[PDB]
Amino acid sequence: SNVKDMSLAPSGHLKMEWAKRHMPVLCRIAEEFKNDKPFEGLTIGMALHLEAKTAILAETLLEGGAKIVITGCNPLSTQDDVAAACVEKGMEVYAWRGETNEEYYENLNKVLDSNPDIIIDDGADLIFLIHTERTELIGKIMGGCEETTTGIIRLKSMAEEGALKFPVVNVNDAYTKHLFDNRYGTGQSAMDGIIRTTNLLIAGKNVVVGGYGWCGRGVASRAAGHGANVIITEVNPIRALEAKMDGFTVLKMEEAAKIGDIFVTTTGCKDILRMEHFLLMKDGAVLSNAGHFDNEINKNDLKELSKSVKEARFNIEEYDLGNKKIYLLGEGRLVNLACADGHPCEVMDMSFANQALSAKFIKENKGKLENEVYEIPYEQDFKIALLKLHSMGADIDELSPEQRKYLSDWK
Amino acid sequence: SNVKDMSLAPSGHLKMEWAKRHMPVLCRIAEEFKNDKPFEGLTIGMALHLEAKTAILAETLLEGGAKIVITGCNPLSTQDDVAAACVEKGMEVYAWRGETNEEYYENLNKVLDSNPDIIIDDGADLIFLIHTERTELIGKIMGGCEETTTGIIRLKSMAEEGALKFPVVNVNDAYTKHLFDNRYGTGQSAMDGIIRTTNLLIAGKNVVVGGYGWCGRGVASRAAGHGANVIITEVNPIRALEAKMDGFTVLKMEEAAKIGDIFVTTTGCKDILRMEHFLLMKDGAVLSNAGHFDNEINKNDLKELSKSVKEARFNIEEYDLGNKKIYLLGEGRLVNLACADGHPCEVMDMSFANQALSAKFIKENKGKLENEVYEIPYEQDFKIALLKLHSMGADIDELSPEQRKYLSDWK
Ligand SMILES: NC(=O)c1ccc[n+]([C@@H]2O[C@H](COP(=O)([O-])OP(=O)(O)OC[C@H]3O[C@@H](n4cnc5c(N)ncnc54)[C@H](O)[C@@H]3O)[C@@H](O)[C@H]2O)c1
Ligand SMILES: NC(=O)c1ccc[n+]([C@@H]2O[C@H](COP(=O)([O-])OP(=O)(O)OC[C@H]3O[C@@H](n4cnc5c(N)ncnc54)[C@H](O)[C@@H]3O)[C@@H](O)[C@H]2O)c1
Ligand SMILES: O=c1[nH]cnc2c1ncn2[C@@H]1O[C@H](CO)[C@@H](O)[C@H]1O
Ligand SMILES: O=c1[nH]cnc2c1ncn2[C@@H]1O[C@H](CO)[C@@H](O)[C@H]1O
């Protein structure tokens, strides 16, 4: 087991203590998993953003009988104290903050070295690595679960070509996931990363958000909530029109780059900000990324234009272009996880609840599932949404029998 | 042709002149229909909310070669001057404001008496009456178009039972329809109806919104925009959770009836507010409805509790319950259409663009379509949204081919 500093373990345990007390839906699932022990004898290899709430998810599976081998899905998002606390919990952990690309793929491989039965992934890199380099593990793998939009794109494009070799559950596209995780979760946590790292006033700034899907909406909403003038970029006209009618300025990036004070890319696509955009930017512009991979902002292009790169502050790099400066947060990686604590607890409670139950779904269908992407059933979303609603002290009306009849027969 | 007063026509012509200048997407389609004359020789029977913007759609179809027989789909939403101007334009009009239930169904039948080829309806009343009482018309009918959520519910359950006898295009569920007409359109137009009729200050009121679908969100956001304390009612926990995280109080209607100052029902279901809720309401509570039919508020219950019903102000009825008064706007009909001029022009431009092209789709697919509910293809939404985006002074970026390879390859 390979972690940064085992002496950091107490601080991580405390953070797990705090998180466990604020994830009620997962806490209930855990008690049911403590009995019925669904994962006894199985190995679950996990590649997630290793902080307190992931550690609780891993703990939920461990107490359910599973052996847990886990690594980080991002070189910068791991929290060393939490990882050390995970080893004290009895987990095989290969993760630290700041690992090289070379080291990143070493830790992924070591997780696969444990011969897992279930794969839990965030971005499909663990799943990808199996199909390309480690085909010798496909036999034992019962199935997987994928957390994020970008991972689903790859998995679906794999499945489309017929390259997918074991079932994978689409956890991202569940109603209680992408509607809350991607929107309200990154809405708060991305602004958290920016505010905590920069100590800059959001109000009165031009905040340029690339893309207006679920993540864009969230960031636009919370940035607008803090008094920003929000500008939206898109390639989808239906979604740009939403942004316009939500009160935002819609521009081609070649234009938004001229006036933006803070940039947040949320597209899942590469090269949102490249050479031509950097040359248009104002002195002092601050750059950040909330989409999975670090290639939305072209760092090689930015290094190419620069005469030097200095530390401007913790998690802020200064690129002196000679005539102006541009700041990059968290090396252009997930600004909410590279520069903050990730999504708030109550939102990750729902996402990891779907994750937990999806692993149980994989187990119970050991050999009966197709080599396809499976969608999460609506009742699971209904159950989780209702539990979360109640924990916040709200409730729902219920249709009377007469009302159900009016809505189903046409009289 | 049967209308209230032909002398009112000049006001109708002016209102149509004004709308035509603010419906650019439909204005383009009309010129193509004037050119290609797709409906030459055909009769189109239409049941829509007969105001200035519906008249433009009818005229657009008239210039496309069609004979137009139109009535209102609601007894109160018709504008008499617009109807008069419609007859001066050469349309067969059977509609006036405030028509009785027998008059409403007499006018519905008169439209069908013209033996139409294409049916354009809002709420499935024409399509329903055809299938039940006027079955001899199925032969000549090529197809239909349905405007609203409620109409689609009926049409889908009809088709599910095998009772649908000609194809109907689902105009409501188009992206450029329910995402903007039901949300932004209803958001502004319903609050206009409430504000315009009552002259009451929205800020500081407890506004109880029934339902949190597309119409619910719009009303809630616009009510909040004006400083109301928004309370949401729902039977869908996923959507109730949305409202909670958008900053609203979520309650069962029994608790909400105790504190609500203004009520807006947006459910499409009957009996949202009944006897038991009227007994809980505050003295002076204002009741309003934005769902298609007037049975979301149980008016029979309210009369039974009332010692008298009198005019309190134009479009306001005072129901004196003896110990308190309850006010009802627009006889519990579409508060944005019974008490105002309906959706804003820019929003109906998109909805009526889809209506026009779907009528063209029906004609060109004569005898080829099944007796099923047809969805509007994505390329139609794309074209419409892009056109609408451009007219509002914004534009969209485009992916380079290299960016298009990245989003499709799983490496
Ligand atoms: N904690 C986090 O930081 C977090 C959480 C959830 C998802 N994500 C990642 O964020 C990304 C999107 O999340 P989603 O759920 O919003 O996906 P989504 O697809 O709803 O949002 C994507 C939007 O980007 C737009 N887009 C694509 N290329 C563009 C371009 N070149 N210029 C402008 N706009 C463009 C698309 O039209 C789409 O609207 C994914 O990579 C996902 O993994 C991150
Ligand atoms: N101009 C207008 O006024 C206008 C425009 C569009 C649609 N509409 C009408 O408004 C209604 C809604 O349209 P939509 O597109 O919102 O449909 P939608 O179904 O998305 O919204 C309906 C919501 O009502 C909720 N609901 C149902 N019964 C309920 C109950 N008893 N208590 C609480 N919540 C309940 C459902 O869960 C759903 O979320 C439909 O009747 C539609 O025809 C009116
Ligand atoms: O605090 C967190 N812990 C674990 N996963 C997280 C956290 N915040 C966000 N994500 C998840 O990371 C993915 C993007 O790579 C998203 O799927 C999001 O849900
Ligand atoms: O001003 C208007 N003219 C015509 N139709 C309208 C207007 N406002 C709303 N609707 C339409 O009425 C239906 C609800 O019964 C909805 O489909 C909405 O699009």
Author numbering:
A (entry chain E), B (entry chain A): 22 to 432
What does the paper say about this structure?
S-Adenosyl-l-homocysteine hydrolase (SAHH) reversibly cleaves S-adenosyl-l-homocysteine, the product of S-adenosyl-l-methionine-dependent methylation reactions. The conversion of S-adenosyl-l-homocysteine into adenosine and l-homocysteine plays an important role in the regulation of the methyl cycle. SAHH depends on the cofactor nicotinamide adenine dinucleotide in its oxidised form (NAD+), which is self-regenerated during the catalytic cycle. The protein structure of SAHHs features three domains in a monomer, the active form is usually a homotetramer.
While archaeal enzymes deriving from the Crenarchaeota phylum (SacSAHH and SsoSAHH) show catalytic activity only with SAH, homologues from T. maritima and the euryarchaeal classes of Methanococci and Thermococci (MiSAHH, MjSIHH, PfuSAHH, TkSAHH, and MmaSAHH) show higher catalytic activity with SIH. This suggests that the hypoxanthine ring is in the imino-hydroxy form, although inosine has been shown to be most stable in the amino-oxo form in water. Similarly, MmaSAHH tetramers and SacSAHH tetramers exhibited an average ΔGint value of −133.5 kcal mol−1 and −127.5 kcal mol−1, respectively.
